[PDB]
Design a protein around this ligand. Structure first.
Ligand code: IHP
Ligand code: IHP
Ligand code: ADP
Ligand code: ADP
Lengths: 752, 752
């Protein structure tokens, strides 16, 4: 008899980078910048202090990516220090950012670990460090031992939310400023309407809203998301106005922000409402892989197929919507421009964890204080999903048991070996499992009970010693996604992939030798699966036309092993088979052999599928003359070569890359590059890493409109000079009135 | 120019059980026993409360062994609950009391583990359980889940030092009373003069001393220890009295007791002073094995060659003196009467640990509060010895590094597996290690660096998968003691045991096949070691005249494998070879085979060594006639058969066991035994386990004067009736007044 919100559903559009500028934060950035290099030849910290959600990390990032900072300091490191940081991993990451080899530093202790960072940071010159979210003095005191004072100016900028810690760091703390009402309205309007200005009738309500928030940017962001969610009518704006007035009666108290979030969370469609709380199953501050979160959504059953739109495409669309609402923060992006990593804001993570734990009983995490004890069987029976990120081996020593647990997730930081006597603890404890993400857990083997988990839907695991997948592994029919990581070079699959009815993905690091696909003699059914979309690394010998036949809709492919077999005339038909797969859009060719036993030549262009959009090559040692073949591809859009992908000293672009957007060349011995503006009409991003041997970059690239961003790392001085000429040329073109997209140039070593 | 305490050193004599009776505590014992059957068909607790060292444990143990308690309750369990108790091990031990095989319980959870105990006590009926040293209320609440409230008259008796927990467990705690002045004097006299009476001259002094102890038995006993250390002269007693009055002005301060202990510690000779404090390296409340502790003293170098006594004998004498002074209390004793296990009292343990860690810097213990962090490299550099009993894997993940560490020992009840990545951590850290006890830690392998560490002197370790000892393991020249535990049935020694000159004792839990002794071709030196004292479990095939020739100082020999190979005279002469050992006290034979493929016959008497005093047979399945040969042996004093070592339905006593003092028979098929008093003149203790078939026990054995203690477990009711007839004859002896120690008969089931 009663119904509300009766309306149709419209389209939601892609999340292109926007509002890259920070509103009004530049003055604070400049005042902070002034205190940098205040006293040469000394190490000092610059505290930044304020309440959560105010914009401290936005300022820190704006400074860290400022031009003057990059020019002044050759070395710069960004490190995250959470509430629950760990020092050894932090030092490993710091050392890794500089070093190239991982083995040397692993056997060392944290003090000898700090000494290497000391020398590394000291040698170059001036260095600027950034510390995010430091909670206690002891954290800073323990961390700082790594930072050396090498008689030259070196600075560190740290952000914290408590006044006492900042007092201890420096006698005088820097205190951030709340936005003025005009700035509040400007930010709200820019976020809600993007380029377009606010309609006159909506202006009066928008001004009142901006004013209530009090100038805390996070509240303005959340309210803007809610406003775009609702739709634009004067009545709707009045309706949001009345509520925001109530919520913003007290502006400084914490819970108010939570209430605002609740508002934004209420309007969310019920499909996205579970996806949004699921993101908070991960640890606070964790960087979520986009593909792994979207796959964990389909297996949970949060995503429901509705017509033609694919489950994975739909899930990516959901993530784009969540980002657009400003609920999810986009940490990184791919070369394609698509999202790569994401995380939730601290306050939003708290809200989501509390809601999912208490109101909805979606999952529970087992976090133990020292006095506390691990729960017993009775309580665990009530749980539906588990999540253990802290000590889990101690949890499994208890020999837990729970029949009503369907999922288990463990996003540990380290990798933990499972004792041989505890391997059966997982299956026997949880025989009704649906998802099992234990990649941070290393399995020496699998007990027999792993093959009776008939309800398993997604599995990800890591095993150092695994070399053979038993036939029994193919018994389970429910699994839709599998991800495998193994240190062993060769993986032999004995489970029959083709009978498996559900799997929509397969992904491995090692090479995979598929069992030959044979139709049963007595069965009418044919083992063709429409659901499969990838085989990340199949062995070259397994690229037989039958195997390609079994996979109709693979939207991606990848081969690891010897590329010569497919390139060789005897087995050239093997590579020619790739023409069969129509859907292909992403092809990766990795080579592991370290001996250049012969030269390699690409077969003609028509062999490659028509849609191929992204291509990556590693250690193939191909001649730069073959680039014409890859140019003949009409759709190919991102091209990456790494670890000497193309070998040769002279390359002359011959055109063909009509629809290309990104070039990525890494660790090649090219010396002379020749090209014209018509070679790459549509290039946007250009990456050149460790090209220690190339004399010059074609100035013709300066004449191309799509060319937006350029990056050079560990390159020759002449290359940097040519890049600086290109920058000047594009600045002149933009100054000449042409509607040319803005040009940015970064040289990783600024002195090049 | 100044000297003091000039005197000669006199003998110290063995610590035989003495003052088994407790002074003036029978009142509380009968009060607690008066709570017996207070309200039938219900579960309740009896709290005992006081200050540390008052006598709560003594009173509880006196009640537990009381005849009335044993009669009323068939099932009785001792349980120790320290401050650092863990629930899971407690349940397993409780179940181990009832059932022989506990493998089914290992895969279970703690709640089902409690259910099994509850069913077991349901079978039992009336039951009294004792809990010692309960610190917190939550401890009692968590533990009590195991005890079934099945509407039976069952009791819990809990001892605690805190009033709050006692009152919460029961609103009427039993407040223990302080010993009176007369009882104080009598207790002091007993502890000092044992069965001898106090000389009149000292009497007054002792009385004063007793009155100054305030009725705290711990103070009285430690003071008696100090007095026995000083001597028995009036000046010594007066000095002790003055010092006691000096150090015990106050009452409620626990540190006063510590001061008293300090007074005893100062007089202890400098040699014993290292031991006394070393004993505290073990975890608080740990049940220290005697052989392990003594050999640790040997390896560390505290026990140095002085005189002619073997190092092991000197260590055993040291432990006996420590016990005599009442610093170390005796937990268990062997059948022959030697000490088996020991521990240190809580207050004395605290005193020793504080002194060792703070003043002498003998070692350091790493116990971490949750907020706390594991020490850094600088701090660890100043440590000479380490001991980790808490989480050690977390410590090793930090990759510690200290070059001045000479010992690393970790004692625990639960074994832990070492990750492969962590395996190299120990060797790199301690290239100068003098001793290593990682028996709780389990190694699948050892890193190559492990076999290089030449400083090691004692090694104890456990490995589940080890099957072969590599030749490199023989390189290490310093090791004096080795102890190995392996689950594998067969151990292959490839290190040249004879080349190694340092080793004094080798002990194993699995058959070891010795590399055949080879005399070096080019070396004048003979590979004969006088230091070696035993090979606990060698393979039968290893028994050879040459191997025995190598070792002339073996007091103990034990063999595990096929006994038939040696026993047959046609092939080889191994059991004839064992004759060539001048002095062999302990000989053990264990048969792996479960089939009587060949009947086994004992070689003649002249083959056995002259002095054999302890002999153990397991599954040998010899015939009762062969008893005569064992009877022909002259000096035999302890004899044990277990697991059907001697099988047959009829045994007629030949006689001649002139010197036998103890006879242990377990798992025998005998039904009838004929004996006369002259057959076993010197019997002291007789033990019968799980003899569900024997018809009767001989009446003549009751005529043996030396016969003191006899116990029957899981025996026939008719056997128990004959045993009660023997006990009635012993009561008749007591009525007569024969100068034979009073005889007590204990049966595991009272109803038998
Ligand atoms: O799948 P692609 O379109 O080919 O992108 C790949 C992929 O990352 P994403 O799937 O998240 O985009 C790689 O990871 P995997 O496919 O193996 O899982 C990743 O790293 P690896 O090639 O080492 O595996 C690589 O990034 P990078 O070039 O830094 O190595 C690159 O992602 P990007 O296009 O963002 O670089
Ligand atoms: O050495 P003890 O402390 O006296 O223990 C002895 C025996 O040793 P002995 O034959 O030298 O007396 C065994 O101890 P170890 O040989 O391993 O050192 C052990 O028997 P198992 O090792 O075969 O189990 C044990 O057995 P239990 O205590 O169960 O009777 C037995 O104890 P007793 O001292 O009472 O004879
Ligand atoms: N001046 C601003 N303009 C645009 N967005 C802002 C501004 N200040 C803050 N934000 C947004 O508010 C959110 C929370 O701010 P954040 O950077 O986390 O500050 P803090 O770390 O101090 O809470 C961020 O996602 C950021 O995008
Ligand atoms: N009547 C007695 N009361 C208490 N302790 C006694 C008595 N007689 C001897 N002792 C000594 O007390 C020691 C153990 O008891 P103690 O630790 O003092 O009490 P509790 O363990 O209950 O605190 C034994 O070594 C024993 O020698």
């Amino acid at each position: 008899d009663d119904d509300l919100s009766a309306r149709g559903s419209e389209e939601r559009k892609p999340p292109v980078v926007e509002e890259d500028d920070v509103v009004g934060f530049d003055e604070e950035a400049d005042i902070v910048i002034n205190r940098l290099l205040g006293e040469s030849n000394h190490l000092e910290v610059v505290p930044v202090v304020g309440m959560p959600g105010l914009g401290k990390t936005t300022l820190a990032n704006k400074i860290y990516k400022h031009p003057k900072i990059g020019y002044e300091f050759f070395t710069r490191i960004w490190v995250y220090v959470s509430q629950s940081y760990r020092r050894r991993e932090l030092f490993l990451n710091i050392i890794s950012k500089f070093t190239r080899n991982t083995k040397q530093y692993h056997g060392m202790c944290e003090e000898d670990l700090a000494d290497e960072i000391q020398e590394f940071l000291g040698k170059g010159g001036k260095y600027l460090v950034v510390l995010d979210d430091v909670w206690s003095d002891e954290a800073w005191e323990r961390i700082k031992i790594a930072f050396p004072n090498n008689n030259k100016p070196n600075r560190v900028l740290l952000t914290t939310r408590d006044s006492k810690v900042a007092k201890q760091c420096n006698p005088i703390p820097h205190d951030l400023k709340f936005l003025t009402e005009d700035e509040s309205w400007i930010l709200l309007e820019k976020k809600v309407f993007h380029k377009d200005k606010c309609p006159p009738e909506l202006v009066l309500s928008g001004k009142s809203i901006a004013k209530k928030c009090k100038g805390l940017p996070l509240a303005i962001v959340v309210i803007a998301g809610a406003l775009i969610g609702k739709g634009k009518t004067p009545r709707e704006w009045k309706q949001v106005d009345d509520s925001v007035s109530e919520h913003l009666i007290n502006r400084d108290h914490p819970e108010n922000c939570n209430k605002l979030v609740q508002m934004s969370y209420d309007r969310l469609p019920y499909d996205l409402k579970a996806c949004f709380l699921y993101c908070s199953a991960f640890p606070g501050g964790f960087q979520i892989p986009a593909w792994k979160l979207i796959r964990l959504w389909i297996a949970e059953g949060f995503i429901q197929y509705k017509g033609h739109l694919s489950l994975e495409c739909k899930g990516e669309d959901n993530l784009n919507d969540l980002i657009n609402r400003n609920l999810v923060m986009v940490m990184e992006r791919t070369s394609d421009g698509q999202i790569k990593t994401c995380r939730l804001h601290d306050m939003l993570h708290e809200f989501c964890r509390q809601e999912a734990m208490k109101e909805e009983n979606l999952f529970q995490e087992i976090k133990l204080g020292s006095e506390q004890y691990f729960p017993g069987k009775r309580e665990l029976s009530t749980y539906r999903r588990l999540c253990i990120h802290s000590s889990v081996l101690d949890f499994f020593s208890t020999k837990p048991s729970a029949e009503h647990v369907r999922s288990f997730l463990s996003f540990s930081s380290k990798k933990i070996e499972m004792p041989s006597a505890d391997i059966p603890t997982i299956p026997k404890g949880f025989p009704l499992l649906r998802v099992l993400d234990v990649e941070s857990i290393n399995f020496s083997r699998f007990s027999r009970e792993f093959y009776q988990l008939y309800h398993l839907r997604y599995v990800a695991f890591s095993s150092d010693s695994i070399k053979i997948l038993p036939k029994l592994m193919g018994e389970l029919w429910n699994i839709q996604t599998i991800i495998i990581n193994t240190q062993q070079r060769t993986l032999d699959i004995q489970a029959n992939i083709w009978n498996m009815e559900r799997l929509r993905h397969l992904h491995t690091n090692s090479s995979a030798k598929l069992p030959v696909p044979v139709a049963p003699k007595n069965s009418k059914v044919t083992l063709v699966n429409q659901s499969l979309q990838t085989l990340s690394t199949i062995a070259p010998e397994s690229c037989t036309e039958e195997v390609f036949a079994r996979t109709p809709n693979l939207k991606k492919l990848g081969i690891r092993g010897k590329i010569s077999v497919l390139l060789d005339n005897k087995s050239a038909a093997s590579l020619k088979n790739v023409k069969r797969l129509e859907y292909l859009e992403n092809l990766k060719l990795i080579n592991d052999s370290s001996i250049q036993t012969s030269k390699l030549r690409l077969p003609p262009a028509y062999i490659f599928p028509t849609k191929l959009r992204k291509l990556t090559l590693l250690d193939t040692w191909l001649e730069w003359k073959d680039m014409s073949i890859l140019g003949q591809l009409e759709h190919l859009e991102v091209l990456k070569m790494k670890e000497n992908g193309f070998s040769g000293e002279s390359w002359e672009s011959t055109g063909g890359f009509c629809s290309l957007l990104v070039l990525w060349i890494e660790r090649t011995n090219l010396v002379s590059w020749k090209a014209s503006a018509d070679d790459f009409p549509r290039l946007k991003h250009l990456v050149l890493i460790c090209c220690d041997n190339l004399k010059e970059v074609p100035i013709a690239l300066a004449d191309i409109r799509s060319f937006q961003v350029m990056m050079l790392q560990n390159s020759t001085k002449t290359a940097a000079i040519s890049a600086r000429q290109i920058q000047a040329k594009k600045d002149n073109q933009t100054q000449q009135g042409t509607k040319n997209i803005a040009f940015k140039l970064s040289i990783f070593p600024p002195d090049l």
